[PDB]
Amino acid sequence: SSCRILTSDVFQDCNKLVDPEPYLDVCIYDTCSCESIGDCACFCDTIAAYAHVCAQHGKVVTWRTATLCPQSCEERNLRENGYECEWRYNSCAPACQV
Amino acid sequence: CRPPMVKLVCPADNLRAEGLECTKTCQNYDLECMSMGCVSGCLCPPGMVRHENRCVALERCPCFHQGKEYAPGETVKIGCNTCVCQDRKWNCTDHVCDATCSTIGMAHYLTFDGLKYLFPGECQYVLVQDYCGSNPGTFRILVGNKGCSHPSVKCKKRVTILVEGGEIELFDGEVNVKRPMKDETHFEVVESGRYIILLLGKALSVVWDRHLSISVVLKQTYQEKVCGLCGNFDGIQNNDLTSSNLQVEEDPVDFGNSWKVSSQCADTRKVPLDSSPATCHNNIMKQTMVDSSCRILTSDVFQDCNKLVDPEPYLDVCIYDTCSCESIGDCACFCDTIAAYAHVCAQHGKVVTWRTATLCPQSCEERNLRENGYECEWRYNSCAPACQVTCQHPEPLACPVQCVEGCHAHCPPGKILDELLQTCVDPEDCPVCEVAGRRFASGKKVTLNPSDPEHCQICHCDVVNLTCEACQEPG
Amino acid sequence: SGKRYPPGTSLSRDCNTCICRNSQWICSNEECPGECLVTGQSHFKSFDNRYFTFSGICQYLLARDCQDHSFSIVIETVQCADDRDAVCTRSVTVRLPGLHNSLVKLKHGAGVAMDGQDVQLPLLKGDLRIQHTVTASVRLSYGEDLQMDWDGRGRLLVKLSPVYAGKTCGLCGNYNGNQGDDFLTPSGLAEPRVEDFGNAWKLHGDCQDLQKQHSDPCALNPRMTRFSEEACAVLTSPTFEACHRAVSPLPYLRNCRYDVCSCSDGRECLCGALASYAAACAGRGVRVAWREPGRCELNCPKGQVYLQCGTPCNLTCRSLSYPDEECNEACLEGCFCPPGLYMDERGDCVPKAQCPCYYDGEIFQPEDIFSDHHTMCYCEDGFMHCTM
Amino acid sequence: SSTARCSLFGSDFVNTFDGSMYSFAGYCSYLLAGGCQKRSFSIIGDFQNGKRVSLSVYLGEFFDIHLFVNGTVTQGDQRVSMPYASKGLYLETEAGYYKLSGEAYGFVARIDGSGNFQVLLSDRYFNKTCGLCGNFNIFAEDDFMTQEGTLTSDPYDFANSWALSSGEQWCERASPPSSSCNISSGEMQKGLWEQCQLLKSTSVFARCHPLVDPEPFVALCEKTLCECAGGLECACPALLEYARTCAQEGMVLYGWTDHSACSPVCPAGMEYRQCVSPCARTCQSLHINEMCQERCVDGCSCPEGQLLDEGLCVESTECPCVH
Ligand SMILES: *[C@@H]1O[C@H](CO)[C@@H](O)[C@H](O)[C@H]1NC(C)=O
Ligand SMILES: *[C@@H]1O[C@H](CO)[C@@H](O)[C@H](O)[C@H]1NC(C)=O
Ligand SMILES: *[C@@H]1O[C@H](CO)[C@@H](O)[C@H](O)[C@H]1NC(C)=O
Ligand SMILES: *[C@@H]1O[C@H](CO)[C@@H](O)[C@H](O)[C@H]1NC(C)=O
Ligand SMILES: *[C@@H]1O[C@H](CO)[C@@H](O)[C@H](O)[C@H]1NC(C)=O
Ligand SMILES: *[C@@H]1O[C@H](CO)[C@@H](O)[C@H](O)[C@H]1NC(C)=O
Ligand SMILES: [Ca+2]
Ligand SMILES: [Ca+2]
Ligand SMILES: [Ca+2]
């Protein structure tokens, strides 16, 4: 039921282009064996993989909330004495920039 | 031997030739010592004692605590009680401080007097009430769990509290009134950070992290006038398992079933006592991975707090919860057990930053993105003040909690926050009220002065309106 | 305890009674005698029932009378194995300022000395009595408000009566009813760490200060994790089911796993930890039979035999020479032989026809006719039928 | 350097990380290495009576391997095949010699054909480990830090301190065995004393003298040339340990076994090379060069051709396929 997020409302656009059944087989295999305690990463990385494939086919996806795989980004603004606030988490942003 | 001390020899006069053997220093001066004779050494004069190789000339030598040196006159703060060493012994006040329940995780409870115990249940239970024995009584706080005999991503808690004829309850991260109480003046809600702080009187308060932790706070006023799963708040720790039937039990699982609300629901079962709860049972590796992750409680960033608060209770909960809890996508049955210890540390003045990007991240960027322009005022904090001033609650409040974690807004001075709008704003744009001049809350919907009909000059204020209604004459 | 009882019953919590009326128990609140316990490696129980472990190596104060000075008890600890976590008690010293300011020393072989001189027991001085026990132990008894037990291999107990409530101080605590103020150090202030607490009651400065109290000595000997976990799971098993309800097991389970992983011979550390729990259960009332050929059935000598619950009233050959003395004892465990046979000097239990007399300190033989110019006596059957 | 070396060679002998030799006729299990403040692992050595049986490695409290000299290996009580790779430990065979690598944990353990143990251990444990192979400072005068934390001079009350019992073992103290050499001697000693002397004289050994002294090596051999019989191969264990030492200190030495008349034992087909590479191209290997750039290793390997296929040597023409 946690891995049925692959077949969820926010992925419906991508489920038509890419079959989720392979990535669902991995989501069950990994986090059955993986005992997750403090780093829910053997689950959140299997879903970030499918979302990466979806984005390469033009389907940008925002599946990540505060109670599911949060991925904060505030540390790259706090090391500066003043909180300049330029770093922000992006669903899918260009990897090739200047 | 050296001049500052004089040599000694065994006299054959008396067997009591206490010399180098019974070497009086500071921490053993008051204590009693054996002796079969002297060692015929060279010992300090009758008017002084050894200390750190120095024969400190006076009996003013330090007054230790936490293995640290304190010269006379120096002070320490323990709780709400300052304490000072006069001659050679500490001299503390007798102001009884405020006590605090807790629901550390899914199935554990920390009494007022301080007693961790294991009680997994699935019924509805009395957490604390004043209706106890020969008391008239004022309130009745309950706690209702569901699917929580085994800690997991199941176990959502529900809490009902009954005070002044009221019924305000809460679940699913929200507070829901069901019956408003009479004296609305004392009712007060503060939604600051990760928490719902909730004030109900001069000597009652509740603190809830929206998921599992229930921390009701009480004051000296009660002092052996309450009972429930939290105990009676009398200082004695051995009598916190006095059940409803007025006797102590040796087993906590039979104590809690005395405090269920429905007599016809299930009694939770005596589990056979094992250190490996559910899934740590047969898998010794997962019993080691859970420990080493829970040994963060004894880590470098907590060393300051490990001296004030023993981590061994909170470590027992960290192993129990996330053994049973199968965490998949929400690592919360681990991160909440450690946020609890950090909250206790902060109340003793020890602010702590334990939270990184690969361990319990807790982002806060959502309260800036909903605005078309990313205004960037909300920021996560190690521990920030829970009692502040806003458009709604502009006045300073009774502050049972010094600071709290969570996503805290911040913008430069001369700007006040509202909660309806995620952003902050100047004061004058708040719907604040001042009718006839005096400073009070933001136009609280309260009938002022029902007491004196002749002096009944009623004045309400919805948002800004300089209004005053008329008092309906009884005749 | 999850059991129905009709109205009008009267339970007892071993010190106080509780009568059922209208679904509520009416309970008496009289004060109860205290028990501070030293056992295992370095496992302590306070008078107010706080359990803790402190592995310090010095001469510590355990219990003192702290408004007057009727007694003081001092405990001497040593490292007791190759492991650094193994720290046992070797001796315990006692001071009675009321009697010559005498100094009793209970030794590691269950011996006893008074001011250097070793002593043959019993030692019926005026106030204090010291006699052996059914288990080759030793019991000090000063008046009627102070009992002790053996510090041969390190299992001291002390019974203090309610007249010492809140007027004692030491590692054993205040004896006031509260568990929370038992880490109360001599400066009138409580410390949260057990390491700092015990290091404040040491009597010598040359000694070291313990920096670290460990909890898992199985980490330094990882060959014993399986034996330690499986051997004391019997304590949480249904073999002890009758006193999980009377006294909590999980500390005694925590002391076993520390002792078997830490000590030299876990034959005896295992079977000394299980006996620590059984003695606690029996103190409430629950007698238990946990002995087996595997689980340490002791080998009583030739004439004697294991006996779960007996009576030390009519056994020894000294009891026949002293009948008008009383036996206000309990039903004890140990090694006896059948009732027609009575112990002797040399531990040989014989009939009462070969039982000597222990008159006037001296010992006479089964038909010694002694006489004087102002009396005549004869030891018949353990009793010396004196006349004038 | 970056690493260390302990060795338990011959009958009862030991060589510490810092160059201290001593005999120990142990009767039970003893700790060889591991942290003395916090143990993430513990290498252990089990004896039956004087003579050694197994090397063991326990990882905290969750995992255990027991490699024997006979070849058997067991995880706990269940006997397992070999090779084996579980939990960051690769139980393999390099150059005819069994190996137990724990580079994540920072150690390499190997037993040879004669049964001699060996432990290589990282510099991340300098003055951070103590046991029967002592500590890993540079000084050899202080290798006897007992488990109580005190020095010592007798090797036994030191090594008896590190005994680690079990529910099944329950071991007693060990004592020096009786010396039947003071009585059994004569023309044997005069002739047999020679083999210990060549460590000095012969040119091949005559250039490690600035690296390490043979003085403690000749001392330990002469007390074992007296009980054996019918040959001169009783001195070569001390002689082999001297070579393995000088190589570890950064001087490999060649051809010393041509005239020494003591060939270290190895299985059929393979003979004792010195300085062979561990990644010997076998019959079912990928031709992947400039990757196995590890240090050169002593051991036995096949002839010039004659590749390896399941623990034997066979010519390349008879290479099989796999399906
Ligand atoms: C990053 O996310 C925002 C909002 O979804 C989007 O407008 C933007 O195009 C993304 N990255 C870029 C710079 O393309
Ligand atoms: C401690 O402080 C109080 C304050 O009133 C004082 O009366 C008392 O003499 C002081 N000494 C002690 C240690 O009680
Ligand atoms: C957290 O709050 C404190 C007190 O306001 C402040 O000093 C600190 O800089 C804040 N840090 C963060 C992470 O916002
Ligand atoms: C203020 O109160 C008056 C009553 O006299 C009412 O008519 C008016 O609408 C109120 N103003 C607001 C903003 O609610
Ligand atoms: C010797 O090897 C055999 C082969 O199966 C094994 O059974 C045995 O246990 C080994 N020796 C010892 C002492 O274990
Ligand atoms: C080794 O560690 C001990 C214990 O801290 C220390 O006393 C000693 O100086 C260290 N020795 C070296 C060579 O660093
Ligand atoms: Ca209480
Ligand atoms: Ca107390
Ligand atoms: Ca050394």
CA distance B258 to B252: 10
Structure tokens at D289: 């060069």
Say if CB D94 and CB D297 are below 8 A apart: yes
The verdict on a CB contact (< 8 Å) between B284 and D60 is no
For the Cβ of B86 lying below 6 angstroms from any atom of ligand 2, the answer is yes
Q: Which residues of B are less than 8 Å from D61 in CB distance?
A: 284, 288
For the Cβ of B468 lying below 6 angstroms from any atom of ligand 4, the answer is no
3-state secondary structure C216-260: CHHHCCHHHHHHHHHHCCCCCCHHHCCCCCCCCCHHHHHHHHHHH
- From the list D115, D112, D139, the residue with the least C-alpha distance to D20 is D139
Say if CB B289 and CB D62 are below 8 A apart: no
Helix (H) or strand (E) holding B37: none
Structure tokens at B253: 């699982």
- Length of chain C, in residues: 388
Q: Is C226 on the interface with D (CB under 8 A)?
A: yes
Looking at this protein, which amino acid is placed at residue B94? Answer: D
The beta-carbon neighbor of B328 closest among A38, A43, A67 is: A43
Name the residue of chain C whose CA is nearest to B267's CA. Answer: C2
Q: What is the DSSP string of D256-310?
A: TTTTS--PPP--TT-EEEEEE-SS---TT-----S---PPPEEEEE--SS-EESS
Q: Which residues of B are less than 8 Å from A68 in CB distance?
A: 329-330
Q: Is C225 on the interface with D (CB under 8 A)?
A: yes
| Residues in CB range of D227: below 8 A, 6 or more apart | D180, D181, D184
CA distances from C300 to C304, C334, C336, C348, C373 (A): 5, 8, 8, 12, 47
Q: What is the DSSP string of D159-202?
A: HGGGB---TTT------PPP--TTTS-SHHHHHHTSTTTHHHHS
Q: What are phi and psi of D119, to 5 degrees?
A: -140, 120
In eight-state DSSP terms, residue B238 is: T
| Residues in CB range of C63: below 8 A, 6 or more apart | C36, C71, C72, C73, C158, C160, C168, C170, C171, C172
In eight-state DSSP terms, residue C124 is: -
Say if CB D29 and CB D169 are below 8 A apart: yes
Looking at this protein, which amino acid is placed at residue B354? Answer: W
Which atom of ligand 6 approaches the CA of D135 most closely?
1
| Residues in CB range of B276: below 8 A, 6 or more apart | B287, B323
Helix (H) or strand (E) holding B80: none
Which atom of ligand 1 approaches the CA of A93 most closely?
11
Tokens 């051709």 belong to D305
Q: What is the DSSP string of C11-44?
A: EE-SS-EEEEETTEEEE------EEEEEETTTEE
Nearest ligand atom owner, CA of B85: 2
Say if CB D83 and CB D67 are below 8 A apart: no
Which atom of ligand 2 approaches the CA of B89 most closely?
13
| Residues in CB range of D8: below 8 A, 6 or more apart | D14, D15, D32, D45, D52, D116, D117, D118
User: Ligand 2: which of B30, B91, B92, B95 to mutate, judged by most atoms within 8 Å of the beta carbon?
Assistant: B91
Distance B351 CA to ligand 9 centre (A): 43
Query: CB atoms < 10 A from the CB of C119, how many?
Result: 12
User: Looking at ligand 3, which residue's alpha carbon is closest to its atom 8?
Assistant: B381
CA distance C108 to C80: 12
Q: Is A38 exposed, middle or buried (0-12, 13-18, 19+ CB in 10 A)?
A: buried
Helices A21-33, A44-56: axis angle to 10 degrees equals: 160
Looking at this protein, which amino acid is placed at residue D223? Answer: K
Name the residue of chain C whose CA is nearest to D61's CA. Answer: C222
Which atom of ligand 1 approaches the CA of A60 most closely?
5
| Residues in CB range of D321: below 8 A, 6 or more apart | none
Helix (H, G, I), strand (E, B) or coil at A87: coil
Say if CB B202 and CB B194 are below 8 A apart: no
In eight-state DSSP terms, residue D88 is: G
User: What is the Cβ-side half-sphere exposure of residue B176, based on CA atoms within 13 angstroms?
Assistant: 10
Q: What is the DSSP string of B137-188?
A: --EEEEEEEES-SS-SS--EEEEEEEETT-EEEEETTEEEEEE--S-TTT-E
Q: What are phi and psi of B295, to 5 degrees?
A: -70, 0
Residues with CB under 6 A from ligand 5: D 53, 68, 70, 72
Report the topology of domain B378-429: Laminin (2.10.25)
For the Cβ of B75 lying below 6 angstroms from any atom of ligand 2, the answer is no
Q: Is A64 exposed, middle or buried (0-12, 13-18, 19+ CB in 10 A)?
A: middle
C-to-D residue pairs, Cβ atoms closer than 8 angstroms:
44
In eight-state DSSP terms, residue C208 is: P
The verdict on a CB contact (< 8 Å) between D60 and B288 is yes
Tokens 């087989």 belong to A25
In eight-state DSSP terms, residue C335 is: E
Helix (H) or strand (E) holding C336: strand C334-336
Peptide bond into C238 cis (omega under 30): no
What are the residue ranges of helices labelled H in B388-429? none
Tokens 């679940």 belong to B171
Nearest ligand atom owner, CA of B468: 4
The verdict on a CB contact (< 8 Å) between C222 and D60 is yes
Say if CB C311 and CB C332 are below 8 A apart: yes
3-state secondary structure D118-139: EEEEEHHHCCCECCCCCCCCCC
Distance A90 CA to ligand 1 centre (A): 7
In eight-state DSSP terms, residue A6 is: G
CA distance D218 to D270: 30
CA distance D59 to C180: 39
b or e along D215-238 (b: 16 or more beta carbons within 10 Å of the residue's beta carbon)? ebbbebbbebbbeeeeeeebbbbb
CA distance D248 to C312: 72
Sign of CA dihedral A48, A54, A57, A62: negative
In eight-state DSSP terms, residue C122 is: P
In eight-state DSSP terms, residue B466 is: -
CA distances from B15 to C73, D22, D275 (A): 20, 50, 75
Q: C-alpha angle C168/C174/C177, rounded to 5°?
A: 130
Looking at this protein, which amino acid is placed at residue D258? Answer: D
Q: Which residues of B are less than 8 Å from D62 in CB distance?
A: 284-285, 287-288
Resolution to 1 decimal place, in Å: 2.8
Q: Which residues of D are less than 8 Å from B282 in CB distance?
A: none
- From the list B57, B83, B58, the residue with the least C-alpha distance to B70 is B83
CA distances from D299 to D55, D95, D212, D311 (A): 19, 5, 22, 15
Neighbours of ion ligand 9 (CB under 5 A): D 18, 135, 137, 139, 142-143
For the Cβ of A93 lying below 6 angstroms from any atom of ligand 1, the answer is yes
Looking at the DSSP bridge assignments, the partners of residue C193 are none
Q: Is B156 on the interface with A (CB under 8 A)?
A: no
Structure tokens at A45: 């990385």
For the Cβ of B346 lying below 6 angstroms from any atom of ligand 3, the answer is no
Say if CB D235 and CB D256 are below 8 A apart: no
Q: Is D60 on the interface with B (CB under 8 A)?
A: yes
CA distance D36 to C83: 11
Say if CB A43 and CB B329 are below 8 A apart: yes
User: What is the Cβ-side half-sphere exposure of residue B400, based on CA atoms within 13 angstroms?
Assistant: 26
Q: What are phi and psi of C159, to 5 degrees?
A: -100, 120
Q: What are phi and psi of B431, to 5 degrees?
A: -80, 65
Q: What is the largest CA-CA distance in chain D?
A: 64
Helix (H) or strand (E) holding C156: none
Say if CB B317 and CB B148 are below 8 A apart: no
Structure tokens at C366: 């089964």
Looking at the complex, report in whole angstroms how far the Cα of residue B237 sits from the nearest Cα belonging to chain A.
33
Distance C1 CA to ligand 7 centre (A): 20
Q: Is C231 on the interface with D (CB under 8 A)?
A: yes
b or e along B120-145 (b: 16 or more beta carbons within 10 Å of the residue's beta carbon)? bbbbbbbbbbbbbeeeeebbbbbbbb
Nearest ligand atom owner, CA of B458: 4
Structure tokens at D267: 């299985």
Q: How far is CA D9 from the centre of its chain?
A: 6
3-state helix, strand, coil in chain C (%, to 5): 15, 25, 60
CA distance B248 to B229: 12
A-to-B residue pairs, Cβ atoms closer than 8 angstroms:
74
CA distance A48 to A28: 15
Looking at the DSSP bridge assignments, the partners of residue D54 are D46, D68
Sign of CA dihedral B421, B423, B426, B427: positive
Name the residue of chain B whose CA is nearest to C105's CA. Answer: B34
CA distance C282 to D67: 48
CA distance C377 to C384: 6
CA distances from B86 to B29, B69, B92, B128, C282 (A): 16, 14, 10, 40, 47
Tokens 């361990």 belong to B359
Q: Is B328 on the interface with A (CB under 8 A)?
A: yes
Looking at the complex, report in whole angstroms how far the Cα of residue C127 sits from the nearest Cα belonging to chain B.
22
In eight-state DSSP terms, residue C350 is: B
3-state helix, strand, coil in chain B (%, to 5): 15, 20, 65
Q: Is B412 on the interface with A (CB under 8 A)?
A: no
The verdict on a CB contact (< 8 Å) between D166 and C223 is yes
Per DSSP, chain C holds a count of helices (H) and strands (E) of 5, 23
Helix (H, G, I), strand (E, B) or coil at D35: strand
CA distance D262 to D199: 14
Structure tokens at A94: 């260009």
CA distance C314 to C327: 9
Sign of CA dihedral B351, B356, B362, B364: positive
Peptide bond into C217 cis (omega under 30): no
User: Looking at ligand 3, which residue's alpha carbon is closest to its atom 7?
Assistant: B384
Tokens 């006839």 belong to B436
Structure tokens at D294: 């590890």
Nearest ligand atom owner, CA of B75: 2
CA distance B62 to B68: 9
CA distance B195 to B214: 10
- From the list D317, B369, D300, C15, the residue with the least C-alpha distance to A62 is B369
In eight-state DSSP terms, residue A29 is: H
3-state helix, strand, coil in chain A (%, to 5): 45, 5, 55
3-state secondary structure B99-119: EECECCCCCCEECCCCCEECC
Please indicate whether chains A and D are in contact, defined as at least 3 beta carbon pairs under 8 Å.
no
Sequence-ordered strand ranges (E) for C66-200:
72-79, 87-96, 102-106, 112-114, 117-118, 128-132, 138-142, 146-148, 157-160, 168-169, 184-185, 189-190
β-strand pairing of B99-100 with D97-101: unpaired
Looking at the DSSP bridge assignments, the partners of residue D35 are D129
CA distance C292 to C236: 17
Strands ordered across the beta sheet of C72-79:
C117-118, C112-114, C102-106, C87-96, C72-79, C59-65, C168-169
Which atom of ligand 1 approaches the CA of A62 most closely?
5
- From the list B51, B21, B14, the residue with the least C-alpha distance to B35 is B21
b or e along D273-295 (b: 16 or more beta carbons within 10 Å of the residue's beta carbon)? bbebbbebeebeeeeeeeeeeee
CA distance B221 to A40: 45
Q: How far is CA B355 from the centre of its chain?
A: 20
User: What is the Cβ-side half-sphere exposure of residue B125, based on CA atoms within 13 angstroms?
Assistant: 29
Say if CB D184 and CB D229 are below 8 A apart: no
Say if CB C27 and CB C16 are below 8 A apart: yes
CA distance D113 to D92: 14
